Amino acid sequence: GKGEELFTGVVPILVELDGDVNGHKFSVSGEGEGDATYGKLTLKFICTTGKLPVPWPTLVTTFVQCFSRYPDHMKRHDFFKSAMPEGYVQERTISFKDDGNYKTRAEVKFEGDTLVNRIELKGIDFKEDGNILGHKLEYNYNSHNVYITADKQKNGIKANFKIRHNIEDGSVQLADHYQQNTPIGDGPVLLPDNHYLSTQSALSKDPNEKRDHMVLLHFVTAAGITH
Ligand code: NA
Protein backbone atom coordinates (compact mmCIF):
# COMPACT_ATOMS: atom_id res chain seq x y z
CA GLY A 1 0.00 0.00 0.00
CA LYS A 2 0.99 3.61 -0.37
CA GLY A 3 1.39 4.29 3.39
CA GLU A 4 3.32 1.05 4.06
CA GLU A 5 5.94 1.98 1.51
CA LEU A 6 6.89 5.14 3.41
CA PHE A 7 8.28 3.00 6.19
CA THR A 8 10.61 0.61 4.37
CA GLY A 9 13.62 2.49 5.60
CA VAL A 10 14.88 4.78 8.45
CA VAL A 11 12.49 7.73 8.89
CA PRO A 12 13.25 10.83 10.99
CA ILE A 13 10.79 11.54 13.82
CA LEU A 14 9.78 14.77 15.56
CA VAL A 15 7.63 14.94 18.67
CA GLU A 16 6.12 18.19 20.00
CA LEU A 17 4.02 18.30 23.13
CA ASP A 18 2.23 21.05 25.09
CA GLY A 19 1.01 19.95 28.47
CA ASP A 20 -0.92 21.27 31.45
CA VAL A 21 -1.08 18.92 34.51
CA ASN A 22 -2.91 20.37 37.54
CA GLY A 23 -2.06 23.87 36.18
CA HIS A 24 1.63 23.07 35.68
CA LYS A 25 2.22 24.15 32.02
CA PHE A 26 5.12 22.62 30.12
CA SER A 27 6.46 21.80 26.69
CA VAL A 28 8.60 19.01 25.33
CA SER A 29 10.48 18.61 22.02
CA GLY A 30 11.71 15.27 20.84
CA GLU A 31 13.71 13.96 17.89
CA GLY A 32 15.10 10.74 16.56
CA GLU A 33 14.33 8.08 14.04
CA GLY A 34 12.33 4.95 13.38
CA ASP A 35 12.68 1.83 11.35
CA ALA A 36 9.62 -0.17 11.16
CA THR A 37 11.37 -3.02 9.43
CA TYR A 38 12.69 -3.88 12.88
CA GLY A 39 9.90 -2.34 14.97
CA LYS A 40 12.52 0.09 16.31
CA LEU A 41 12.70 3.69 17.37
CA THR A 42 15.09 5.86 19.21
CA LEU A 43 14.03 9.28 20.61
CA LYS A 44 15.52 11.97 22.82
CA PHE A 45 13.08 14.40 24.56
CA ILE A 46 13.95 17.75 26.16
CA CYS A 47 11.64 19.78 28.44
CA THR A 48 12.01 23.18 26.84
CA THR A 49 10.19 25.03 29.63
CA GLY A 50 12.57 24.00 32.46
CA LYS A 51 11.83 21.22 34.90
CA LEU A 52 9.29 18.61 33.77
CA PRO A 53 6.50 18.68 36.39
CA VAL A 54 5.55 15.00 36.08
CA PRO A 55 7.80 11.90 35.88
CA TRP A 56 9.22 11.23 32.40
CA PRO A 57 7.90 7.67 32.32
CA THR A 58 4.30 8.85 32.53
CA LEU A 59 4.69 10.48 29.09
CA VAL A 60 6.29 7.56 27.13
CA THR A 61 3.06 6.24 25.64
CA THR A 62 2.01 9.77 24.61
CA PHE A 63 5.31 10.58 22.87
CA VAL A 64 4.07 6.65 16.80
CA GLN A 65 2.66 3.16 16.39
CA CYS A 66 3.26 3.40 12.65
CA PHE A 67 6.82 2.21 13.60
CA SER A 68 5.50 -1.14 14.84
CA ARG A 69 6.79 -4.19 13.00
CA TYR A 70 3.84 -5.90 11.41
CA PRO A 71 4.75 -9.41 10.24
CA ASP A 72 4.16 -9.90 6.57
CA HIS A 73 1.12 -12.19 7.29
CA MET A 74 -0.37 -9.36 9.35
CA LYS A 75 0.31 -6.40 7.03
CA ARG A 76 -3.42 -6.16 6.15
CA HIS A 77 -4.02 -5.22 9.81
CA ASP A 78 -1.68 -2.19 9.92
CA PHE A 79 -4.03 0.77 10.28
CA PHE A 80 -1.27 3.10 11.35
CA LYS A 81 0.83 3.00 8.22
CA SER A 82 -2.22 2.80 6.00
CA ALA A 83 -3.32 6.31 7.09
CA MET A 84 -0.02 7.88 5.94
CA PRO A 85 1.06 10.31 4.72
CA GLU A 86 -2.05 12.34 5.69
CA GLY A 87 -2.03 10.64 9.07
CA TYR A 88 -4.29 10.03 12.01
CA VAL A 89 -5.67 11.62 15.15
CA GLN A 90 -4.76 9.60 18.28
CA GLU A 91 -6.81 10.35 21.40
CA ARG A 92 -6.33 8.78 24.84
CA THR A 93 -7.63 8.80 28.37
CA ILE A 94 -4.89 7.62 30.73
CA SER A 95 -6.30 6.85 34.17
CA PHE A 96 -3.68 6.65 36.97
CA LYS A 97 -5.24 4.35 39.57
CA ASP A 98 -5.99 6.24 42.82
CA ASP A 99 -4.76 9.47 41.19
CA GLY A 100 -5.47 11.81 38.25
CA ASN A 101 -5.86 11.33 34.57
CA TYR A 102 -4.31 12.55 31.31
CA LYS A 103 -6.41 13.28 28.29
CA THR A 104 -4.34 13.50 25.09
CA ARG A 105 -5.00 14.47 21.52
CA ALA A 106 -2.27 14.04 18.93
CA GLU A 107 -1.90 14.29 15.15
CA VAL A 108 0.59 11.88 13.62
CA LYS A 109 1.49 12.64 9.98
CA PHE A 110 4.29 13.28 7.56
CA GLU A 111 5.76 16.73 7.09
CA GLY A 112 7.94 16.13 4.09
CA ASP A 113 10.12 13.13 4.84
CA THR A 114 9.62 13.48 8.58
CA LEU A 115 7.12 11.64 10.75
CA VAL A 116 5.65 14.14 13.20
CA ASN A 117 3.69 13.54 16.42
CA ARG A 118 2.07 16.81 17.64
CA ILE A 119 0.33 16.44 21.03
CA GLU A 120 -1.80 18.41 23.46
CA LEU A 121 -1.98 16.87 26.97
CA LYS A 122 -4.27 17.84 29.82
CA GLY A 123 -3.97 16.29 33.27
CA ILE A 124 -6.43 16.81 36.10
CA ASP A 125 -7.15 15.62 39.58
CA PHE A 126 -3.71 14.61 40.57
CA LYS A 127 -2.80 14.40 44.23
CA GLU A 128 0.02 16.66 45.39
CA ASP A 129 1.71 13.87 47.19
CA GLY A 130 0.75 11.11 44.84
CA ASN A 131 3.23 9.26 42.78
CA ILE A 132 3.00 11.65 39.78
CA LEU A 133 3.20 15.11 41.37
CA GLY A 134 5.32 13.66 44.17
CA HIS A 135 7.82 12.16 41.70
CA LYS A 136 7.84 8.75 43.23
CA LEU A 137 8.10 6.71 39.97
CA GLU A 138 11.33 4.97 39.01
CA TYR A 139 13.14 5.92 35.80
CA ASN A 140 12.53 2.64 33.99
CA TYR A 141 9.82 1.00 31.87
CA ASN A 142 8.05 -2.33 31.58
CA SER A 143 6.95 -4.42 28.61
CA HIS A 144 3.28 -4.41 27.64
CA ASN A 145 0.55 -5.73 25.33
CA VAL A 146 -1.53 -3.16 23.44
CA TYR A 147 -4.92 -4.64 22.40
CA ILE A 148 -6.29 -3.27 19.13
CA THR A 149 -9.74 -3.57 17.67
CA ALA A 150 -11.34 -1.98 14.64
CA ASP A 151 -13.76 0.90 14.88
CA LYS A 152 -15.61 0.58 11.58
CA GLN A 153 -18.02 3.49 12.16
CA LYS A 154 -15.04 5.81 12.37
CA ASN A 155 -12.87 4.06 9.83
CA GLY A 156 -10.32 3.76 12.61
CA ILE A 157 -9.27 1.73 15.59
CA LYS A 158 -9.50 1.51 19.36
CA ALA A 159 -6.98 0.16 21.82
CA ASN A 160 -7.05 -0.78 25.49
CA PHE A 161 -4.03 -1.62 27.70
CA LYS A 162 -2.54 -1.41 31.16
CA ILE A 163 0.80 0.32 31.71
CA ARG A 164 2.62 -0.55 34.94
CA HIS A 165 4.96 2.16 36.36
CA ASN A 166 7.36 0.95 39.03
CA ILE A 167 7.19 3.07 42.23
CA GLU A 168 10.46 3.67 44.14
CA ASP A 169 9.11 1.71 47.17
CA GLY A 170 8.75 -1.43 45.09
CA SER A 171 5.04 -1.04 44.40
CA VAL A 172 3.33 -0.29 41.06
CA GLN A 173 1.31 2.66 39.72
CA LEU A 174 -1.19 1.38 37.18
CA ALA A 175 -2.02 3.66 34.20
CA ASP A 176 -5.04 2.30 32.37
CA HIS A 177 -5.06 3.42 28.72
CA TYR A 178 -8.01 3.83 26.41
CA GLN A 179 -7.25 4.93 22.87
CA GLN A 180 -9.06 5.92 19.66
CA ASN A 181 -7.52 6.66 16.32
CA THR A 182 -9.25 8.19 13.27
CA PRO A 183 -7.78 9.06 9.88
CA ILE A 184 -7.01 12.64 8.84
CA GLY A 185 -7.06 12.19 5.04
CA ASP A 186 -9.22 10.46 2.54
CA GLY A 187 -6.99 7.58 1.35
CA PRO A 188 -8.10 4.10 1.99
CA VAL A 189 -7.26 2.73 5.50
CA LEU A 190 -6.88 -0.74 6.82
CA LEU A 191 -9.39 -1.92 9.42
CA PRO A 192 -7.72 -4.69 11.39
CA ASP A 193 -8.82 -7.90 12.95
CA ASN A 194 -8.29 -8.03 16.71
CA HIS A 195 -4.56 -8.30 17.55
CA TYR A 196 -2.00 -6.79 19.88
CA LEU A 197 1.28 -4.96 19.86
CA SER A 198 4.08 -6.36 22.12
CA THR A 199 6.22 -3.49 23.41
CA GLN A 200 9.53 -3.09 25.18
CA SER A 201 11.32 0.16 26.21
CA ALA A 202 14.56 1.22 27.77
CA LEU A 203 15.01 4.69 29.30
CA SER A 204 18.40 6.30 29.65
CA LYS A 205 20.11 9.68 30.14
CA ASP A 206 22.58 11.48 27.87
CA PRO A 207 25.51 12.09 30.15
CA ASN A 208 26.34 15.30 28.28
CA GLU A 209 22.86 16.78 28.46
CA LYS A 210 22.12 19.19 31.33
CA ARG A 211 18.54 20.02 30.48
CA ASP A 212 15.74 17.83 31.88
CA HIS A 213 15.37 15.03 29.29
CA MET A 214 14.70 11.43 28.47
CA VAL A 215 16.32 9.02 25.96
CA LEU A 216 14.03 6.20 24.79
CA LEU A 217 14.90 2.98 22.87
CA HIS A 218 11.69 1.17 21.92
CA PHE A 219 10.73 -1.96 20.07
CA VAL A 220 7.32 -3.03 19.05
CA THR A 221 5.98 -6.11 17.22
CA ALA A 222 2.44 -6.88 16.19
CA ALA A 223 1.21 -10.35 17.32
CA GLY A 224 -1.73 -12.43 18.33
CA ILE A 225 -2.42 -13.76 14.84
CA THR A 226 -0.63 -17.05 13.90
CA HIS A 227 1.19 -18.30 10.78
NA1 NA B 1 8.70 -3.42 41.97
UniProtKB/Swiss-Prot annotation:
Phenotype for residue 141 to H: In mut1.3; shifts fluorescence lifetime from 3.03 to 2.78 ns. In mut1.5; shifts fluorescence lifetime from 3.03 to 2.72 ns. In mut1.27; shifts fluorescence lifetime from 3.03 to 2.85 ns
Effect of residue 68 to A: Increases fluorescence at warmer temperatures such as 37 degrees Celsius. In GFPmut 3; highly fluorescent mutant when excited at 488 nm
Mutagenesis or variant effect for residue 171 to G: In GFPA; leads to enhanced fluorescence at 37 degrees Celsius. In Venus; leads to yellow fluorescence, improved maturation and reduced environmental sensitivity
Effect of residue 29 to R: In mut1.28; shifts fluorescence lifetime from 3.03 to 2.76 ns. In mut2.2; shifts fluorescence lifetime from 3.03 to 1.94 ns. In mut3.3; shifts fluorescence lifetime from 3.03 to 1.88 ns
Post-translational modification: Contains a chromophore consisting of modified amino acid residues. Maturation of the chromophore requires nothing other than molecular oxygen.
Effect recorded for residue 167 to V: In EBFP1.2; shifts the excitation and emission spectra to shorter wavelengths and increases quantum yields compared to BFP
Pfam family, one: GFP
Consequence the record notes for mutating residue 65 to L: In RSGFP4; increases fluorescence and shifts the major exitation peak to 489-490 nm
Effect of residue 63 to L: In EGFP; increases fluorescence at warmer temperatures such as 37 degrees Celsius. In EBFP; gives rise to variants with blue fluorescence
Effect of residue 141 to F: In Sapphire/H9-40; exhibits a huge Stoke's shift, with an excitation peak at 399 nm and an emission peak at 511 nm. In Azurite; shifts the excitation and emission spectra to shorter wavelengths and increases quantum yields compared to BFP
Annotated tissue distribution: Photocytes.
InterPro entries: GFP, GFP-related, Green_fluorescent_prot
Effect on the protein of changing residue 141 to A: In Cerulean; leads to improved quantum yield, a higher extinction coefficient and is 2.5-fold brighter than ECFP
Keywords: Chromophore, Luminescence, Photoprotein
Effect of residue 101 to T: In EBFP1.2; shifts the excitation and emission spectra to shorter wavelengths and increases quantum yields compared to BFP
GO biological process, one term: bioluminescence
Biotechnology: Green fluorescent protein has been engineered to produce a vast number of variously colored mutants, fusion proteins, and biosensors. Further generation of mutants led to more stable proteins (at 37 degrees Celsius for example) with brighter fluorescence and longer fluorescence lifetimes.
Mutation effect (residue 220 to R): In Azurite; shifts the excitation and emission spectra to shorter wavelengths and increases quantum yields compared to BFP
Effect in UniProt of substituting residue 124 to V: In EBFP2.0; shifts the excitation and emission spectra to shorter wavelengths and increases quantum yields compared to BFP
Keyword Ribonucleoprotein: no
Functional note: Energy-transfer acceptor. Its role is to transduce the blue chemiluminescence of the protein aequorin into green fluorescent light by energy transfer. Fluoresces in vivo upon receiving energy from the Ca(2+)-activated photoprotein aequorin.
Family from the record: Belongs to the GFP family.
Assembly description: Monomer.
Protein name: Green fluorescent protein
Top-level taxonomy: Eukaryota, Metazoa, Cnidaria, Hydrozoa, Hydroidolina
